[PDB]
RNA sequence: GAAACAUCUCAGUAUCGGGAGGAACAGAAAACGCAACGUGAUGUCGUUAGUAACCGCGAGUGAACGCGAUACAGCCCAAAC
RNA sequence: GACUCGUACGGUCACUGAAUCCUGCCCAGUGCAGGUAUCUGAACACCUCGUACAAGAGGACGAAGGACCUGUCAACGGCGG
RNA sequence: AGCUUUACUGCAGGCUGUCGCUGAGGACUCUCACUCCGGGAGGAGGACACCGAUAGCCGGGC
């Protein structure tokens, strides 16, 4: 047959790709040399369009002008501070180590100085649980438990912009609006109504898939589809 | 609208152009590739042995 | 007596073992963080160089080239094969690494002409193998008995056509009897059955 | 059918009858070196492996009788033309 | 083609990549093995021979030594000192 | 290398197709997933036989997989005499 | 010819054992290769992974 949908992505053709040209600021963390020092000053509020939710335009005494992951409340004029031994506020950033447990973190570390990468999406927030002299356990957003380098630093309180999933999408328009801002095809054609050749649950004189839709791991791409070694269906049960 | 006659209309674009390095109207001023003599694309000038019979 | 060479020699007998096998495990690394081609002013084993041809002179030049380990870099067949032209996991090249070097080498070295090479190790996943050079326009080479005879025009391009050592044995030439029937005078004049 | 276990009969050998004793034979197992051994890992390849790519067939209703004939005497053995049979049972 | 077809065949062909010359390549035996008290670098031509060898031992595929000719031509390093 | 200047309030893969009242029963087969005493399970290394070596024969060990067991149908589907 | 599948035969791809890279003191410690993070100092990981080779299973994705 011809290449399944899943296979015309990876060729990274426009389509596929997310219009990063149009985005504003990689978002990480900074590289204070040391000490805690550096500190700096919210100057404006921007709207991230890779992330549909706000993000501080902030400058330092360096003088050093950067986007920052903007955690809830957080405004002009309000001075936010980064390093070792920065405060323990909303908004400052330090190793998890110095941060006391209990309290909501969102743009945490993987590896120390990586930048951040967990809990940074629309509200979501993590959760700093345990400390030692190695491991810093971190109770990430999709529940997990994350066992962290207390070196890795991160941010106090939920990310901004928390809540948007509530309200409906409504109509499809505002659907469109939303997916072009991502790196995403959208509107999405079901495979069983395709033809054989396109899917392989395409086909049928009625529409459904051809044989079960839990697949094994070890499918080929261009055969992976429908359930992904799914360890379970249904609601029932 | 067909894909004829009515479709024929819209062609004012222009593509192939005298070449500079082989003289034919064959240089693609979109690519800036001739397809006559590869000038754009290689340095030794295009040619392969499927423009003649084999044994020939 | 034993030449001092004869030591340089004996040493690679075993690349593996004593002080050599240590030399390598060190060396590499600075190598695994060199490029693809390297010219270097002195040949890693010197009996082997000057042996295949080697000369501390002008004119004469050398360098070390690492390759990937390993069967043909293949892609699979995008249209119609019967099962024996579907290979691709077990299928490899008709060139041996060592040629692949002596030629990514010559090709750095526009110039020059490919005298010899012979082989310095090999890691996990590449080998390296250093390449005797020679410029052919130089008057300390076309004067020098022992090696003039590479100015020749016919001496042109030698690596590509096979006409190096390691790509006269490459061409199933090493028997002279039982066994090159198929092989000389040449590969293309037997219709490419060796 | 059922069959004695020893008889007497002709022995090509002696060229006289003597008691022969019968039995069936029992496969020999292979070495795995003979010349169509070696041809198999010799033209096998990728892809179809022609004659060698194929599997056993399968078999008649009823199987041919496969004895030996073992002379009492000069204790050599012979073999005879066969004849189907379901089953043989010895006597003896 | 095998009166299907997969090995085999078409064929190392068509075609593709890289490169030399006026011709290229080969070449002075870790050869041959008419087994010899024998031949003596290499191409090529004739023959050896549709022989030996290969092969769903199917269809098909297929040399070499030697011999008669052509032309002949033998040398240089590494190392020891 | 795309997703990704992205990080589970994410994005990938599928099914159904606004709202409203609802969505029963079935894990035997097939699929997927988890487990597993025992059974089965290749190659290298290892032992025995073999061969002055080798081919080869046998053994011990045992991975994923399977047998066997469990979960799962808003998973393929079923819902009779 | 396109298409399908528990048709025949194979080929990618995935999982898995083994060998090489590969080192020190049937479960175990370590650092020095190799890997990733850090601008760097340095951190994490570590003879695993990656990669090359091979073997078994799955394997209309082709
Ligand atoms: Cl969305
Ligand atoms: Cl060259
Ligand atoms: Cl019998
Ligand atoms: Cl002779
Ligand atoms: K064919
Ligand atoms: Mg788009
Ligand atoms: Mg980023
Ligand atoms: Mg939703
Ligand atoms: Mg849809
Ligand atoms: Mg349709
Ligand atoms: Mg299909
Ligand atoms: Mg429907
Ligand atoms: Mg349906
Ligand atoms: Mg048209
Ligand atoms: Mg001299
Ligand atoms: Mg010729
Ligand atoms: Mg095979
Ligand atoms: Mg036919
Ligand atoms: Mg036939
Ligand atoms: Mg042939
Ligand atoms: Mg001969
Ligand atoms: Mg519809
Ligand atoms: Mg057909
Ligand atoms: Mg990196
Ligand atoms: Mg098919
Ligand atoms: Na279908
Ligand atoms: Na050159
Ligand atoms: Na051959
Ligand atoms: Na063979
Ligand atoms: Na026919
Ligand atoms: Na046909
Ligand atoms: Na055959
Ligand atoms: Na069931
Ligand atoms: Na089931
Ligand atoms: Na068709």
Redesign the interface.
């Given at each position: 047959g011809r290449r399944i949908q899943g296979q015309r992505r990876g060729r990274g053709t426009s389509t596929f790709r997310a219009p990063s040209h149009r985005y504003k600021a990689d978002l990480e963390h900074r590289k204070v040399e040391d000490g805690d020092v550096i500190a700096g000053t919210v100057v404006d509020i921007e709207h991230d369009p890779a992330r549909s939710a706000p993000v501080a335009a902030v400058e330092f005494e360096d003088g050093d002008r950067r986007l920052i992951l903007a955690p809830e409340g957080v405004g002009v004029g309000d001075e936010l501070q980064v390093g070792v031994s920065a405060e323990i506020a909303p908004g400052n950033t330090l190793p998890l180590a110095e941060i006391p447990e209990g309290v909501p973190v969102c743009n945490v570390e993987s590896s120390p100085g990586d930048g951040g990468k967990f809990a940074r999406a629309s509200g979501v927030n993590a959760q700093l649980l345990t400390h030692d002299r190695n491991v810093a356990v971190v109770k990430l957003p999709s529940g997990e438990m994350k066992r962290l380098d207390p070196q890795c630093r991160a941010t106090i309180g939920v990310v901004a912009g928390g809540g948007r999933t509530d309200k409906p999408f409504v109509k499809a328009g505002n659907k469109h609006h939303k997916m072009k801002a991502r790196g995403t095809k959208w509107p999405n054609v079901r495979g069983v109504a395709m033809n054989a050749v396109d899917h392989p649950f395409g086909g049928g004189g009625r529409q459904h898939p051809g044989k079960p839709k839990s697949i094994s791991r070890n499918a080929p791409p261009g055969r992976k589809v429908g359930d992904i070694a799914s360890k379970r269906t249904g609601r029932g049960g | 609208t067909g894909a004829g006659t009515p479709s024929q209309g819209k062609k004012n674009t222009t593509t192939h152009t005298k070449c500079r390095r082989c003289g034919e109207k064959s240089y693609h001023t979109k690519k800036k590739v001739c397809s006559s003599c590869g000038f754009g694309k290689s340095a030794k000038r295009r040619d392969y042995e499927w423009q003649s019979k084999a044994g020939e | 007596a034993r030449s001092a060479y004869s030591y340089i020699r004996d040493a690679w007998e075993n690349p593996g073992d004593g002080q050599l096998a240590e030399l390598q495990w060190q060396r590499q690394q600075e190598w695994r963080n060199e490029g693809a081609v390297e010219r270097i002013e002195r040949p890693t084993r010197l009996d082997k160089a000057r042996s295949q041809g080697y000369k501390a002179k002008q004119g004469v030049i050398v360098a070390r080239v690492s390759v990937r380990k390993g069967s043909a870099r293949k892609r699979r067949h995008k249209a119609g094969r019967?099962?024996?032209?579907?290979?691709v996991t077990?299928?490899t090249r008709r060139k041996d690494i060592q040629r692949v070097a002596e030629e990514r080498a010559s090709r750095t070295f526009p110039n020059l002409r490919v005298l010899n090479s012979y082989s310095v190790g090999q890691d996990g996943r590449q080998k390296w193998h250093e390449v005797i050079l020679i410029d052919p326009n130089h008057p300390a080479i076309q004067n020098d008995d022992d090696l003039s005879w590479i100015c020749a025009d016919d001496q042109a391009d030698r690596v590509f056509r096979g006409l190096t050592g390691a790509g006269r044995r490459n061409r199933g030439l090493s028997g002279k009897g039982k066994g090159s029937e198929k092989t000389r005078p040449s590969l293309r004049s037997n219709g490419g059955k060796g | 059918m059922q069959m004695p276990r020893r008889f007497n009969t002709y022995c090509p050998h002696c060229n006289e009858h003597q008691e022969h004793e019968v039995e069936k034979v029992r496969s020999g197992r292979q070495t795995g070196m003979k010349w169509i051994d070696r041809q198999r890992e010799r033209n096998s390849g990728i892809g179809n492996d022609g004659k060698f790519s194929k599997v056993p067939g399968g078999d008649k209703p009823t199987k041919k009788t496969d004895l030996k004939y073992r002379c009492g005497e000069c204790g050599k053995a012979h073999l005879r033309e066969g004849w189907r049979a379901g089953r043989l049972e010895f006597q003896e």
């Amino acid at each position: 047959g011809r290449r399944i949908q899943g296979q015309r992505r990876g060729r990274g053709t426009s389509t596929f790709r997310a219009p990063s040209h149009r985005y504003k600021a990689d978002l990480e963390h900074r590289k204070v040399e040391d000490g805690d020092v550096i500190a700096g000053t919210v100057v404006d509020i921007e709207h991230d369009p890779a992330r549909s939710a706000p993000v501080a335009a902030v400058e330092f005494e360096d003088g050093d002008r950067r986007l920052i992951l903007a955690p809830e409340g957080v405004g002009v004029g309000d001075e936010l501070q980064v390093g070792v031994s920065a405060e323990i506020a909303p908004g400052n950033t330090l190793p998890l180590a110095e941060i006391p447990e209990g309290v909501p973190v969102c743009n945490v570390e993987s590896s120390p100085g990586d930048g951040g990468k967990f809990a940074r999406a629309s509200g979501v927030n993590a959760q700093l649980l345990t400390h030692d002299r190695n491991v810093a356990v971190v109770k990430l957003p999709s529940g997990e438990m994350k066992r962290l380098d207390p070196q890795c630093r991160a941010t106090i309180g939920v990310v901004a912009g928390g809540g948007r999933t509530d309200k409906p999408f409504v109509k499809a328009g505002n659907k469109h609006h939303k997916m072009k801002a991502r790196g995403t095809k959208w509107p999405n054609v079901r495979g069983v109504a395709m033809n054989a050749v396109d899917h392989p649950f395409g086909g049928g004189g009625r529409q459904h898939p051809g044989k079960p839709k839990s697949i094994s791991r070890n499918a080929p791409p261009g055969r992976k589809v429908g359930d992904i070694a799914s360890k379970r269906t249904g609601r029932g049960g | 609208t067909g894909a004829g006659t009515p479709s024929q209309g819209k062609k004012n674009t222009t593509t192939h152009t005298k070449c500079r390095r082989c003289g034919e109207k064959s240089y693609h001023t979109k690519k800036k590739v001739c397809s006559s003599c590869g000038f754009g694309k290689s340095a030794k000038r295009r040619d392969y042995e499927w423009q003649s019979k084999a044994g020939e | 007596a034993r030449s001092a060479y004869s030591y340089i020699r004996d040493a690679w007998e075993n690349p593996g073992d004593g002080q050599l096998a240590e030399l390598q495990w060190q060396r590499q690394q600075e190598w695994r963080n060199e490029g693809a081609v390297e010219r270097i002013e002195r040949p890693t084993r010197l009996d082997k160089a000057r042996s295949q041809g080697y000369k501390a002179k002008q004119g004469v030049i050398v360098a070390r080239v690492s390759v990937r380990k390993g069967s043909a870099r293949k892609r699979r067949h995008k249209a119609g094969r019967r099962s024996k032209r579907q290979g691709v996991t077990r299928i490899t090249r008709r060139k041996d690494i060592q040629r692949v070097a002596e030629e990514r080498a010559s090709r750095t070295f526009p110039n020059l002409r490919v005298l010899n090479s012979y082989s310095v190790g090999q890691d996990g996943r590449q080998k390296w193998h250093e390449v005797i050079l020679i410029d052919p326009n130089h008057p300390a080479i076309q004067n020098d008995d022992d090696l003039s005879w590479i100015c020749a025009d016919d001496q042109a391009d030698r690596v590509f056509r096979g006409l190096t050592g390691a790509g006269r044995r490459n061409r199933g030439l090493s028997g002279k009897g039982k066994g090159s029937e198929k092989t000389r005078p040449s590969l293309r004049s037997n219709g490419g059955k060796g | 059918m059922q069959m004695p276990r020893r008889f007497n009969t002709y022995c090509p050998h002696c060229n006289e009858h003597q008691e022969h004793e019968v039995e069936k034979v029992r496969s020999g197992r292979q070495t795995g070196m003979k010349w169509i051994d070696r041809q198999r890992e010799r033209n096998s390849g990728i892809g179809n492996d022609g004659k060698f790519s194929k599997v056993p067939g399968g078999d008649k209703p009823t199987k041919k009788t496969d004895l030996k004939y073992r002379c009492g005497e000069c204790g050599k053995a012979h073999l005879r033309e066969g004849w189907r049979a379901g089953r043989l049972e010895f006597q003896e």
